[PDB]
């Protein structure tokens, strides 16, 4: 997770504790079970409409930021357009889910 965390920050994505505009939040679970970034990166790319911002939560703050949004499965991603994807999904599935949230 240490390597993953640094890779997410090296992307410029901002960290958020249990504390907006057009942005998405990535919640992580212990890597010993990490591919969510690239896919999300791809998703946003396929949706040029918003100037999506991205924020990430470490292991603890992902626990907290999850119940609040009733997220029981990880990796998960919260979509805010101006103020939720959860679990593992093949590229195809993910897109339809994000396509539903947007429209």
Domains and their CATH numbers in the chain: 1-103 (3.40.30.10)
Exposure of 4 in the CB half-sphere (CA atoms within 13 A): 19
Q: What is the largest distance, in Å, between two alpha-carbon atoms of the chain? A: 36
Given resolution (angstroms): 2.8
Q: Tell how many helices (H) and how many strands (E) occur in the chain.
A: 4, 5
Question: In angstroms, rounded to a whole number, what is the distance separating the alpha carbons of residues 66 and 77?
Answer: 10
Q: Where are the beta strands (DSSP E) in the chain?
A: 14-15, 22-27, 53-57, 76-81, 85-86
Contacts for 42 with CB less than 8 Å, ≥ 6 apart: 91
| Residue 11 per-residue DSSP state | T
> With contact defined as beta carbons under 8 Å apart, do 80 and 22 qualify?
yes
- How is residue 64 written in tokens? 């907290």
DSSP string, 62-73: HHHHHHTTT--S
Contacts for 75 with CB less than 8 Å, ≥ 6 apart: 26, 27, 28, 29, 34, 35, 36, 86, 87, 88
Dihedral class, residue 3 (left if φ above 0, else alpha if ψ from -120 to 50, else beta): alpha
> With contact defined as beta carbons under 8 Å apart, do 37 and 6 qualify?
no
Question: In angstroms, rounded to a whole number, what is the distance separating the alpha carbons of residues 22 and 54?
Answer: 9
Q: How many CB atoms lie within 10 A of CB 96?
A: 10
Contacts for 96 with CB less than 8 Å, ≥ 6 apart: none
Task: Residue 29: name the closest of 55, 60, 54 by CA.
Answer: 60
| Residue 48 per-residue DSSP state | T
């Amino acid at each position: 997770f240490s390597a993953l965390w640094q890779r997410l920050l090296t992307r410029g994505w901002q960290p958020v504790e249990a504390s907006v505009g057009d942005g998405v939040i990535l919640l992580s679970s212990d890597p010993r079970r990490s591919d969510n970034p690239v896919m999300i990166a791809e998703l946003l790319r396929e949706f040029p409409q918003f100037d999506w911002q991205v924020a990430v939560a470490d292991l603890e703050q992902s626990e907290a930021i999850g119940d609040r949004f009733n997220v029981r499965r990880f990796p998960a991603t919260l979509v805010f357009t101006d103020g939720a994807l959860s679990g593992i999904h093949p590229w195809a599935e993910l897109l339809t889910l994000m396509r539903s949230i947007v429209d």
